[PDB]
Amino acid sequence: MNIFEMLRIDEGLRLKIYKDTEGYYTIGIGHLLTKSPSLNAAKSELDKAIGRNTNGVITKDEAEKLFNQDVDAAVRGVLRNAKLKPVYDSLDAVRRAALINMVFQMGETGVAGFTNSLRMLQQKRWDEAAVNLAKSRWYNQTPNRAKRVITTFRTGTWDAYKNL
Ligand SMILES: [Cl-]
Ligand SMILES: [Cl-]
Ligand SMILES: [K+]
């Protein structure tokens, strides 16, 4: 297990434009295109993202290319954020992947707002952090996925992803 495998499980793989859990146009491995309700707008973003006139369908290779870019960007955002970096730096590799997961899902800004949870994580108060994490819109809207991530922070193991 690693961040790529983890996110591939949490995000799936779809080669045609579809709507994510929030109703937003996405493609590939959780690559958010736009929050716009306009499919055309989404197609335009896709084309720009891939570098070609696609008409809403991409190849597996293409999907993976955006995925790699997206994971990289997530990590990059964590390292640049004053709130996140310190936590990230304080974590072991498994846990670091769980934080990246959250950032891919909600963005730098969104995770940076989990102030209290972040603090518990930096204090290495696993159970408490887990409890706190669950008190969020994130957990309520995507409970199975959140549970997986939370378990990862709680245990520092990949048990939640084991066998998926
Ligand atoms: Cl992009
Ligand atoms: Cl879920
Ligand atoms: K998805």
The DSSP bridge partners found for residue 27 are: 31
8 A C-beta contact, residue 115 and residue 129: no
Name the residue ranges covered by the structural domains of the chain: 1-164
Tokens of 95: 């846990």
Annotated catalytic residue, options 5, 10, 20, 47: 20
Phi and psi (nearest 5°) for 56?
A: 60, 15
Q: At what angle do helices 3-11 and 143-155 cross, to 10 degrees?
A: 160
**142 Cα–ligand 3 center, Å:** 11
On whether 117 is known to bind a ligand per the annotation, the reply is yes
19/111 Cα distance (integer angstroms): 22
Q: Given this structure, which CATH class describes domain 1-164? A: mainly alpha
Closest CA to 101 of 77, 80, 137, 134: 77
| 25-28 sheet: strands from edge to edge | 14-19, 25-28, 31-32
Contact in structure between 26 and 18 (CB atoms under 8 Å)? yes
Residue 30's contacts (CB-CB under 8 Å, 6 or more residues apart) are 7, 10, 11, 12, 20, 67, 70, 104, 105
User: Phi and psi dihedrals of 93, rounded to 5?
Assistant: -55, -40
Query: Kindly report the CA angle at 70 between 17 and 117, in degrees rounded to 5?
Result: 110
